[PDB]
Design a protein around this ligand. Structure first.
Ligand SMILES: Nc1ncnc2c1ncn2[C@@H]1O[C@H](COP(=O)(O)OP(=O)(O)O)[C@@H](O)[C@H]1O
Lengths: 435, 97, 322, 242
């Protein structure tokens, strides 16, 4: 219909319509029957479709069908055409708003925009830090008529949180057909983003009260106002959920009655190639601050990715609950290096490597419990830096007391231990008399 | 900050809503003593000005009449009595019938 | 030695060291060629800045002395200490003629009004009080600061007093009517020191900031406020706007003041350095490694080419200017 | 009045609902426009203050920024009005009454913050000391439209009730009194050459003084004939008086 509106002189023809509908039907089956599974399952489903369908399909020998979208003209077009190698502004490096385009990113954005346009509740499932909130917000940027309100569920979450959110952001107005709950602002659809939908505790009879409450509001279009036992109908209110996989500790599987109303998309961790692309773009944007260091973007990104991968593999939730590593730590790495490089007019390669190692220590070693894990982190930081940055001063870059502070200077520069100790002693002398 | 009489007179003078084209009568229904009525000495004289301490002077429009409705003048001075035309309403004017 | 252009030079003249505790503040005698320094050992030592010879110690305070000041004639010295007391010293006889109580906690600043008949002080109880010199009676209590008031300084004519506090704001009060003329809040950390702009620098400030000449003829009082965010900000008291921000200290700024000629800004910080700022170009000209530890205060002699800086290393230094 | 007269009529029972609706809408349009006229007047004589003065930005920065924002909002509302200039359309604007109330409050807040500016402008033209703050703001802000300044000349001059202007309203040709008596300036004062209110007002008063002096000289020359004369005819005396 939108294409017909865009072309009043040449409406859609029947042959183009049937081609488009067939291709989109195959695409929709693929993204509906495997959107909540890994990439391998999606490839298997695509292979089965290719083996059993009669619809024209992409000719690529190895590229799976799910990598191809359906253009409005009615032909398969690869998703790779919508992922350009952008150049991020230096002042927007690793910012929360900026999203580096990626095949998975664009596919998930299109899928969410498809589901969000119908005001259909949806759930994004995946490991923490994979990009569920990022993808949802990026998709919502394409829908100017929607306001997102973030709610964070926990083990003690009850429908009272939803009621407070409704009181803050919506109003109960009396209508001849009954009481209707709608957002205070007009013409906009309120989107309720629930970040931890599967944490709320199940009672001894296997029921989550807030999940049943959401199911009631979704299927029946409203709920009951317990103050006066009056049915309240929802208007212009939408639900979006995010959650870790149900197999994770502290997570409970969702009710099958609730799941039928919500399609589920699986947002997995970006692969080494995707991580390399994203953070190479970030480093290229970052390293333009110092022109002499521009040639070190690729080895720096490779070292970052390698160390992150080994840290993720070595430390898991089996040992400690807080041993969770994600692209969020990589983003914090890039942000830390960028903030350390902003005031510096120039810096040798050894200084950049020292900043890299300092940020690696601050992100991957602070949360470690045992001393052996910290020793492992130190040794592997040294080995990674040697491997990806050969022919550099080892001692100048990895003097073990890696300390950085802006207490002894206007900028964030390395600080000697003895000078810092003396300064902290004097500051403590002032601290005693002041605080 | 304008007082009640000052605000009324200024609103009449400004004539934002056509006050000057009407017949404006200001009636002072109450007691008269030199503390407040002597401030109207310039208003009730031929000057026709309401001089305020801030240096502002408000001219009396020709369509505005200053009215006093009093029961006695045992405290008004001669300056106040001199500046106005008196109409005497004896109690015999209003019979019980 | 241009009569209004000299700046201090890294060869120090003398390094006087007699204090047993960190030196709090150092000032110059307006008339005599004598220098007075206050320290945390409850002593106020008096030095001669030409020959670098110690003269005498003014004791009587129980706790650390936090601020000292002279009147216009130099015949009286007002000192405040951590024992909640302000003492008036007869500098001719070097005796304490009056001790003033009334502050509820540590008193961190004191100053004598330009008329010389009143004393203004700021303390930790978030109040600024005014005292008569003759009677020692408290007559005013400037309240409104939400935290420890660190400094108080009157302007040239004495009609305005400025104060800085731990509440990260600088307030300018009116002495006559006690009202707060302006509340200068742009520093991101605690404000340490303030200083007024002398009349000789009004034209220089106006031309450096690009401020158009007012039809009144008075550019308006200008104020400086060194703070712990390692920045110095010049303010316009009349409008309440920050004219410029001076960046370049590596630590908390402890003192700030103008050159008597009104062409440069002299400031000391805890980065162990004394810096000379060219506010015409909003840049720092010269940096002096003044002391081996934190620098607490500095003073600039009105006529003679001499700069004195106190420090926590218990040493008071005199700098020749060339 | 017509609605009330219908109300007192016995046949009003059948027409109660729509008559009440019209009463409500008339009351609401009156309530809206009563504050609208005042808000328009205040914006009119504040925009002149904040645009025709170059040093008000330096004297009152914060108030200047506040008024610039308020004027931007007022111009947005005025453009919305001009898009649909129907009285019912602007009446039915979402929150038009509330916007008018907040505009009136903000303009009043700005107006009370222009005290010292007025007390300083009084130094330019000395006769401004006998003019109220609201009247002074109206005079200074509305200097361009000299048609409405005719009501303020009686508060500054002994007998100059109004001034005489050309068709273009750009040159002062003379002054007038309350009785219609007029004095024609020998050298008319041009507002275009002296755009600021105070300079051309000072030129007007100086021209009035010199014009009265010259006319006194001419009248003395004309009347010396009547002196030292045994007999004086009526008609020449009457025309000299006129
Ligand atoms: N394509 C990409 N471009 C930029 N940043 C990305 C990309 N993919 C992942 N990230 C990073 O991964 C993180 C995703 O975390 P988040 O979306 O908050 O996880 P969750 O939604 O599970 O809470 C973001 O901080 C972002 O910086």
């Amino acid at each position: 219909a939108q294409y017909n509106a865009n072309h009043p002189d040449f409406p859609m023809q029947i042959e183009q319509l049937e081609r488009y509908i067939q291709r989109y039907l195959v695409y929709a089956i693929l993204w509906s029957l495997s959107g909540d599974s890994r990439l391998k399952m999606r490839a298997e489903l695509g292979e089965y479709i290719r083996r059993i369908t009669t619809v024209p399909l992409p000719t690529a020998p190895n590229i799976p069908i799910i990598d191809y979208e359906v253009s409005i003209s009615g032909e398969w077009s690869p998703w790779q055409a919508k992922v350009p190698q952008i150049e991020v502004e230096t002042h927007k490096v690793a910012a929360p708003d900026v999203v580096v385009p990626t095949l998975d990113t664009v596919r998930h954005e299109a899928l969410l925009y498809t589901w969000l346009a119908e005001h259909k509740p949806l759930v994004l499932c995946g490991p923490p830090g994979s990009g569920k909130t990022m993808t949802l917000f990026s998709a919502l940027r394409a829908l100017p008529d929607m306001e997102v309100v973030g709610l964070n569920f926990s083990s003690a979450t009850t429908p009272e949180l939803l009621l407070k959110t409704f009181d803050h952001y919506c109003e109960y107005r009396r209508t001849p057909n009954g009481v209707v709950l709608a957002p205070v602002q007009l013409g906009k659809w309120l989107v309720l983003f629930c970040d931890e939908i599967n944490l709320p505790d199940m009672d001894k009879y296997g029921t989550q009260r807030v999940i049943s409450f959401i199911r009631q509001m979704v299927e029946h279009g409203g709920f009951y106002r317990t103050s006066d036992q009056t049915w309240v109908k929802l208007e212009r209110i939408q639900f979006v959920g995010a959650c870790n996989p149900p197999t994770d500790p502290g997570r409970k599987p969702l009710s099958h009655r609730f799941l039928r109303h919500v399609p589920v998309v699986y947002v997995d961790y970006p692969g080494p190639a995707s991580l390399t692309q994203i953070y190479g773009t970030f480093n290229r944007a970052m390293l333009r601050l110092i022109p002499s260091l521009r040639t070190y973007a690729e080895p720096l990104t490779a070292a970052m990715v390698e160390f992150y991968t080994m840290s993720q593999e070595r430390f898991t939730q089996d040992t400690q609950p807080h041993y969770i590593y994600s692209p969020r730590e990589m983003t914090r790495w890039v942000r830390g290096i960028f903030e350390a490089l902003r005031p510096l007019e120039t810096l040798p390669v050894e200084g950049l490597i020292r900043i890299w190692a300092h940020e690696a220590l601050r992100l991957f070693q602070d949360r470690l419990v045992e001393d052996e894990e910290r020793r492992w982190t130190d040794e592997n930081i040294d080995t990674v830096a040697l491997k990806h940055f050969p022919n550099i001063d080892r001692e100048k870059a990895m003097s073990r007391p890696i300390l950085y502070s802006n207490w002894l200077s206007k900028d964030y520069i390395p600080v000697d231990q003895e000078e810092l100790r003396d300064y902290v002693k004097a500051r403590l002398k002032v601290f005693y008399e002041e605080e | 900050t304008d007082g009640l009489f000052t605000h009324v007179l200024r609103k009449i003078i400004d004539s934002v809503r056509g006050e000057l084209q009407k017949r404006q009568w200001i009636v002072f229904d109450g007691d008269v003593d030199p503390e407040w009525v002597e401030n109207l000495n310039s208003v009730l004289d031929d000057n026709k000005l309401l001089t305020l301490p801030n240096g502002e002077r408000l001219s009396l429009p020709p369509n505005v009449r200053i009215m006093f409705e009093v029961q006695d003048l045992k405290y008004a001075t001669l300056a106040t009595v001199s500046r106005c035309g008196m109409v005497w309403f004896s109690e015999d004017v209003l019979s019980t019938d | 030695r241009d009569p209004k252009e000299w700046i201090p030079r890294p060869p120090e003249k003398y390094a006087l060291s007699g204090h047993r505790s960190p030196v709090t503040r150092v000032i110059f005698h307006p008339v005599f060629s004598v220098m007075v320094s206050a320290s945390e050992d409850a002593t106020i030592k008096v030095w001669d800045y030409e020959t670098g010879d110690f003269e005498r110690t003014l004791k009587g305070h129980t706790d650390s002395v936090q601020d000292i000041s002279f009147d216009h004639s130099g015949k009286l010295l007002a000192s405040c200490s951590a024992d909640m007391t302000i003492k008036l010293w007869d500098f001719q006889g070097f005796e304490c003629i009056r001790t003033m109580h009334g502050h509820d906690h540590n008193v961190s600043s004191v100053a004598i009004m330009p008329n010389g008949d009143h004393i203004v002080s700021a303390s930790r109880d978030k109040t600024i009080k005014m005292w008569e010199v003759q009677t020692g009676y408290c007559v005013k209590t400037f309240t409104g600061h939400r935290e420890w008031v660190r400094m108080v300084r009157p302007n040239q004519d004495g009609t305005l007093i400025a104060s800085c506090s731990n509440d990260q704001t600088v307030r300018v009060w009116v002495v006559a009517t006690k009202e707060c003329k302006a509340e200068l809040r742009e520093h991101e950390h605690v404000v340490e020191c303030i200083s007024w702009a002398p009349e000789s620098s009004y034209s220089s400030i106006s031309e450096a900031t690009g401020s158009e000449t007012k039809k009144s003829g008075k550019p308006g009082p200008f104020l400086l406020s060194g703070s712990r965010d390692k920045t110095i900000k010049m303010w316009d008291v009349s409008t309440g706007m920050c004219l410029m921000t001076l960046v370049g200290h590596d630590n908390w700024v402890r003192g700030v003041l103008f050159h008597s000629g009104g062409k440069f800004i002299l400031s000391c910080a805890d980065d162990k350095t004394l810096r000379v700022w060219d506010y015409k170009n909003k840049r720092c000209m010269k940096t002096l490694n003044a002391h081996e530890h934190f620098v607490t205060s500095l003073d600039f002699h009105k006529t003679a080419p001499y700069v004195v800086t106190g420090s926590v290393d218990q040493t008071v230094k005199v700098w020749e200017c060339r | 009045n017509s609605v009330s007269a219908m109300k007192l009529s016995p046949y009003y029972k059948v027409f109660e609902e729509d008559a009440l609706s019209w009463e409500d809408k008339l009351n609401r349009i009156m309530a809206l426009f009563d504050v609208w006229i005042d808000v328009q007047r205040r914006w009119v004589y504040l925009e002149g203050i904040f645009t025709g003065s170059a040093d008000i930005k330096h004297l009152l920065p914060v108030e200047t920024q506040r008024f610039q924002s308020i004027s931007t909002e007022f111009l947005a509302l005025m453009k919305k009005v001009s898009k649909s200039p129907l009285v019912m359309d602007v009446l039915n604007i979402q929150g038009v009454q509330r916007s008018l109330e907040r505009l009136a409050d903000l303009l009043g807040k700005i107006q009370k913050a222009l005290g010292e500016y007025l007390e300083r402008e009084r130094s330019s033209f000395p006769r401004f000391y006998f003019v109220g703050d609201e009247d002074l703001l109206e005079i200074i802000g509305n200097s361009k439209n000299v048609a409405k300044l005719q009501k303020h000349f009686k508060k500054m001059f002994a007998g100059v009730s109004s001034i005489i202007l050309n068709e273009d309203n750009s040159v002062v040709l003379g002054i007038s009194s309350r009785e219609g008596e007029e004095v024609m300036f020998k050298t008319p004062v041009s507002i275009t050459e002296h755009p600021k209110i105070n300079e051309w007002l000072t030129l007007v008063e100086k021209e009035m003084r010199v014009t009265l002096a010259k006319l006194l000289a001419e009248s003395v020359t004309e009347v010396e004939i009547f002196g030292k004369a045994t007999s004086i005819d009526p008609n020449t005396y009457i025309t000299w008086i006129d």
